[PDB]
Amino acid sequence: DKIVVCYYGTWATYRTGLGKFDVDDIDPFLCTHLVYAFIGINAEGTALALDPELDVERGNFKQFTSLKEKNPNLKTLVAVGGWSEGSAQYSIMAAEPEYRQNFIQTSLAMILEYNFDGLDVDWEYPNRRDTVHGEDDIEQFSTLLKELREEFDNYGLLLTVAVSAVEEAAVQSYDVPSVAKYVDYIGVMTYDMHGAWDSVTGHNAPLFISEGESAEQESTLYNVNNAVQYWLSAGCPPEKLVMGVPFYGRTFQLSDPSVNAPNSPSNGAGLAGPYTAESGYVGYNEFCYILQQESSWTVQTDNLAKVPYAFLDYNWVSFDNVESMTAKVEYANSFNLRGIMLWSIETDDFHGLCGEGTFPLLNTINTVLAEGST
Ligand SMILES: CC(=O)N[C@H]1[C@H](O[C@H]2[C@@H](O)[C@@H](NC(C)=O)[C@H](O[C@H]3[C@H](O)[C@H]4N=C(N(C)C)O[C@H]4[C@@H]3CO)O[C@@H]2CO)O[C@H](CO)[C@@H](O)[C@H]1O
């Protein structure tokens, strides 16, 4: 009954050398659900491949779903949306019955032709960013899910969502009971809690209160516990709540290197990984290697938030390791959550270069779920 929902950022195939991660780098027995990120839409609802040369011409959709030839119990979904896809087109599509119907039919066509087992909806986000219809998106999102479910039930297909985590974000976008009603599960994106957009350093996925935070109005802080408890309290049953964890960290440039605790002033985004190549975030594979190769880094545990962080002069990095992943899965076990969702498989230490075996984060998730440790 416990599930492990693995997202694959399919553009990782274009990384070079040790960062390159293709479909055949996936271990299909370390996930119960594997999700191909991402397809997109136009405003008229037509589902479409975002990288047709890879997805279609080079057969990547079908190579991905063919992982079921190795693990016949694996479910392989396709995810529509994502951060880069924005909100406007989803807002327009969801408001019009004709566009919703077009989305249902065109997404179903892709699912069946490429042998996917269902659809994950990652609209980021109803009533936010470049939304066109504003608060109406909250209703139209639930209507879209209802209509997808009605059609998908004719084929036995899965329907899931990925959602923003903390209360102040969730209340802008979702009616929780009507979202939960139509989906097989809700993947709560319990990460990106803090990042280089903030004025101070902070953890990507702190479990509880963090160093440097006030305990007054503790329920308003951006942490995993507050988000999970919000979703449970708002009507998501535990058997439909899948708790997200990150396989990447976020990086900052300190304002003053001598002030290097969490919640210390930051000047902006920090280092980039050699393969992900974007200032402000780093894959676990990249950062564990950096730490292994450069002894000058200081790694500390925030024993309030239950997560590690590292600093070296101006660099300050929040990340998650085997120990913090263990704490996260133990938390999920303690609340009888349906399982663990991860963004994303291609930045685990998939080559085992950091000395804890291949896929240390993903193996940790599977081990702690199987053992039931709370
Ligand atoms: C297709 C594309 O736009 N590729 C971009 C790439 O965009 C990525 C990254 O910004 C991802 N960030 C990280 C830390 O991996 C980002 O991940 C988001 C994702 O959209 C959300 N959806 C989920 N689910 C669990 C459904 O989790 C979140 C994650 C984590 O926040 O996704 C976008 C694409 O939407 O960005 C790089 C440079 O950043 C660019 O080269 C190009 O590869």
Side-chain angles (χ1 to χ4, degrees):
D1 169 79
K2 296 310 190 207
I3 64 176
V4 178
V5 180
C6 297
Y7 282 86
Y8 174 32
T10 57
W11 51 92
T13 187
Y14 299 114
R15 295 164 190 170
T16 64
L18 295 163
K20 185 175 166 62
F21 190 106
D22 304 327
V23 168
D24 67 3
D25 285 297
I26 297 173
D27 188 329
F29 284 104
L30 291 178
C31 311
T32 60
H33 297 69
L34 262 155
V35 189
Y36 192 107
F38 285 111
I39 63 170
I41 69 168
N42 66 22
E44 300 73 35
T46 298
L48 47 89
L50 291 176
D51 187 358
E53 177 65 19
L54 173 65
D55 307 325
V56 181
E57 175 57 36
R58 296 172 65 202
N60 213 49
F61 283 149
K62 184 65 169 161
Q63 287 181 230
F64 185 86
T65 62
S66 290
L67 292 165
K68 291 182 283 185
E69 284 158 31
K70 186 56 177 178
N71 178 4
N73 297 321
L74 177 70
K75 298 301 189 170
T76 59
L77 310 187
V78 67
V80 63
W83 177 256
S84 301
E85 266 281 289
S87 182
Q89 294 169 112
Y90 296 85
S91 180
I92 294 164
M93 173 272 289
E96 282 311 308
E98 299 86 354
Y99 295 166
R100 291 198 305 264
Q101 179 181 78
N102 187 49
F103 177 69
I104 294 163
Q105 293 307 130
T106 57
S107 69
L108 174 66
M110 294 181 77
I111 285 162
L112 295 173
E113 77 182 300
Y114 300 118
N115 199 35
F116 285 103
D117 301 292
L119 178 69
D120 181 51
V121 184
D122 180 25
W123 170 2
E124 304 199 354
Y125 300 93
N127 188 37
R128 298 179 62 194
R129 301 176 77 205
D130 59 345
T131 172
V132 170
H133 296 299
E135 260 187 29
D136 204 49
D137 289 359
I138 303 170
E139 170 190 349
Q140 304 309 324
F141 183 58
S142 287
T143 300
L144 174 66
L145 296 174
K146 176 185 182 191
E147 295 178 356
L148 281 158
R149 167 59 60 185
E150 282 169 353
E151 183 67 25
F152 278 22
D153 274 353
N154 295 312
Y155 307 89
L157 292 168
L158 295 170
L159 177 64
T160 66
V161 294
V163 298
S164 59
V166 302
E167 182 172 358
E168 312 94 309
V171 302
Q172 297 178 60
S173 294
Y174 314 114
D175 177 79
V176 175
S178 60
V179 170
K181 173 170 185 183
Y182 298 118
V183 301
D184 291 281
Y185 56 78
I186 295 178
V188 186
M189 293 188 283
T190 36
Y191 38 72
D192 306 319
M193 296 282 173
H194 300 288
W197 52 86
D198 287 328
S199 65
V200 297
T201 59
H203 301 302
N204 186 34
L207 199 46
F208 306 110
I209 193 165
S210 301
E211 287 172 13
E213 292 186 315
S214 165
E216 303 144 329
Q217 63 184 10
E218 192 162 357
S219 68
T220 69
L221 299 169
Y222 298 166
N223 58 53
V224 174
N225 174 62
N226 282 339
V228 168
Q229 298 306 311
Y230 169 72
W231 280 87
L232 292 172
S233 76
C236 186
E239 68 264 23
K240 287 191 175 183
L241 201 168
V242 182
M243 193 186 86
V245 300
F247 282 17
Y248 61 97
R250 295 193 167 281
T251 74
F252 299 75
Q253 178 191 27
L254 291 167
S255 298
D256 186 331
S258 66
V259 183
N260 47 43
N263 284 288
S264 301
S266 168
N267 194 59
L271 69 75
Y275 310 110
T276 52
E278 191 61 46
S279 298
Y281 91 94
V282 63
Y284 176 77
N285 63 318
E286 296 172 309
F287 199 59
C288 75
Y289 185 77
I290 282 163
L291 291 177
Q292 178 181 267
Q293 301 301 116
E294 177 50 65
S295 66
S296 296
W297 287 89
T298 299
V299 180
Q300 285 174 340
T301 292
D302 184 328
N303 208 16
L304 300 176
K306 319 299 178 181
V307 288
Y309 61 101
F311 55 87
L312 176 54
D313 296 326
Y314 278 96
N315 298 288
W316 192 101
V317 177
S318 158
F319 67 110
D320 273 277
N321 59 12
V322 163
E323 308 98 280
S324 70
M325 197 59 66
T326 297
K328 278 167 169 69
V329 183
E330 287 171 346
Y331 176 91
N333 283 343
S334 73
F335 285 98
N336 196 35
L337 303 187
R338 178 62 180 289
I340 298 296
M341 174 180 78
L342 59 137
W343 185 272
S344 47
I345 191 171
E346 69 271 7
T347 63
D348 205 346
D349 184 24
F350 61 104
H351 291 317
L353 303 181
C354 295
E356 294 187 288
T358 61
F359 289 107
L361 298 185
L362 190 49
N363 274 293
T364 296
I365 292 166
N366 278 269
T367 291
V368 180
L369 285 174
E371 297 177 356
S373 302
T374 60

